[PDB]
Each structure stands twice: as C-alpha cells, then as structure tokens.
Amino acid sequence: EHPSIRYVAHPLPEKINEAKVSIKAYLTQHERKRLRRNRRKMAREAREIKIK
C-alpha cells in the first residue's frame, strides 16, 4: 500500500539547457564575390557623388 503497485509513473524528463551556438553561416565563393562587387560598387558611387 505505501508504495502502490497499481500506478505507472511518467516523471518529468529534465531538458538540458543546450547552449544556442549561432551557426557560422558560410558563403559560396560566388556569393562572396557578389557581395564584394556590390559594396565596393556602392562605395565608388558614393565617392563619385561626393566628388561630383
């Protein structure tokens, strides 16, 4: 009686606090190139405007 034979326990499964390591999203070479092209282009444009 003091420990019941009848019941089956389903105790709370303790979830471990997994540290969210934000994933290093990489770039394709092409993507990188595009980025380089665009930022640089923008800079150039700015220079032109700020020199014209």
Add this chain to the structure above:
RNA sequence: AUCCUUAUGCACGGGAAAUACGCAUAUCAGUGAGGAUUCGUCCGAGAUUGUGUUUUUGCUGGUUGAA
C-alpha cells in the same frame, strides 16, 4: 610570444583582359549542371532563356582652333 597553411576583407606594388563583365519577381540545377573515356570508367559545377552595356564607364590636362 615567434614561424607557417588555408580562406576571405583592406590595401602598396606589378601584370593581363575588357569578344569581356554584369543584371534578372525568369526556367533547371551536387536529390547531378555540364563535361570527359583507353569503354572498364573518370571529372564534377554551372546550364538554359531573357537582357544591358561591350572599337568602351567616370574624371582630368594640353594644344589648338572658334575668331
């Protein structure tokens, strides 16, 4: 702390080319694009279509003429 590898970002410098370099509310693409081959197999990343410039873009200097 010193030395080195990789990638990238910024730049000195040097070189080549622009028939080249993009762009896309496109279509498809390592769940295979496109290729090789001694035929056993092998390489493996763009291809298609559309389109913008492309004997050139942006800026300077000179002589000159113009008169």
